[PDB]
Design a protein around this ligand. Structure first.
Ligand SMILES: Nc1nc2c(ncn2[C@@H]2O[C@H](COP(=O)(O)OP(=O)(O)OP(=O)(O)O)[C@@H](O)[C@H]2O)c(=O)[nH]1
Ligand SMILES: C[S@@+](CC[C@H](N)C(=O)[O-])C[C@H]1O[C@@H](n2cnc3c(N)ncnc32)[C@H](O)[C@@H]1O
Ligand SMILES: [Mg+2]
Length: 259
């Protein structure tokens, strides 16, 4: 049993009020008041982020932890926050975005955010059985939360295997992907093998809530994986009891227009 396993158990044991306060203590949170209503009413001429994912990927790019370029593939695009971010980057020439959709899953939001015309969305697509194709940048933000850490570990393992398949097709592609449950043993083993062959490392974004252990793997960074995970598990375990609120910041606005 790992520190992350203990964190998950302590999380599940919170009362409702305890969980709510812990979830957001000390986290950066974009102000989505305007964006949320525009999307709800069906406004398409908007550059405000379609989800909280946009600011997360922007942070990784602005830190130099990812370098989005060329032909990008967004595996599990959901509402499209990462696809719209990538399409706005001058170094990106095209985005192919795929998501399963259906009951309980978010379909792409359709807006004129800058570079929208460079995105090809395909909903109703399972990426785990889809054959890889050529790409310069492979992104994947898949990892559905579950109160069961063993399920979260298996979900994470499937994402890492997907990334190995895309790297097999594209050995030189840059990769950025969510690692939902990085502390599980089969996840450590799989990440170690990934890092051995492809380089990379893990990083925690400041927008990720304390109710998730998610870390992002990128081929553009480095770092001992076990040390990265345990550092994160301890920061999460130490935040239990903190009463400070979230840190509110403006939502990303990418502007509108074609590229
Ligand atoms: N103690 C407690 N734990 C909870 C509760 N709800 C969720 N959790 C735990 O927190 C984990 C993450 O919960 P969520 O924040 O809803 O997961 P998410 O993927 O971010 O969900 P979205 O907000 O829809 O994006 C769950 O897998 C549970 O382990 C709750 O009401 N009480
Ligand atoms: C919420 S999204 C990522 C958020 C996105 N990066 C953004 O910025 O809006 C994760 C998506 O992956 C989708 N997904 C999960 N499993 C999938 C699968 N096997 N194939 C395709 N899409 C999948 C889920 O429906 C979900 O919408
Ligand atoms: Mg989660």
């Amino acid at each position: 049993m790992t520190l992350g396993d203990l964190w998950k158990r302590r999380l599940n044991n919170c009362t409702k009020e305890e969980f709510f306060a812990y979830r957001r203590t000390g986290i950066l949170e974009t102000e989505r008041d305007k964006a949320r209503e525009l999307l709800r009413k069906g406004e398409t001429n908007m550059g405000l982020a379609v989800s909280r994912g946009t600011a997360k990927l922007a942070w990784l790019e602005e830190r130099g932890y990812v370098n989005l370029k060329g032909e990008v593939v967004d595996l599990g695009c959901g509402r499209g926050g990462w696809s719209y971010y990538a399409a706005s980057r001058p170094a990106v020439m095209g985005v192919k975005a795929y998501t399963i959709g259906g009951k309980g899953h978010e379909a792409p939001k359709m807006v004129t955010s800058l570079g929208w015309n460079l995105i090809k969305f395909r909903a109703g697509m399972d990426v785990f059985t889809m054959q890889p194709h050529r790409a310069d940048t492979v992104m994947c933000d898949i990892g559905e939360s579950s109160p069961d850490a063993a399920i979260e570990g298996e979900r994470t393992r499937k994402v890492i295997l997907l990334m190995e398949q895309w790297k097999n097709r594209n050995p030189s592609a840059s990769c950025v992907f969510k690692v939902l449950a990085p502390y599980r043993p089969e996840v450590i083993e799989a990440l170690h093998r990934f890092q051995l062959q492809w380089g990379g490392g893990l990083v925690r974004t400041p927008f990720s809530r304390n109710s998730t252990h998610e870390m992002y793997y990128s081929t553009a960074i480095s770092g001992n994986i076990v040390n990265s995970v345990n550092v994160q598990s301890r920061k999460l375990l130490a935040r239990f009891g903190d009463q400070r609120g979230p840190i509110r910041v403006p939502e990303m606005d990418l502007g509108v227009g074609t590229r």
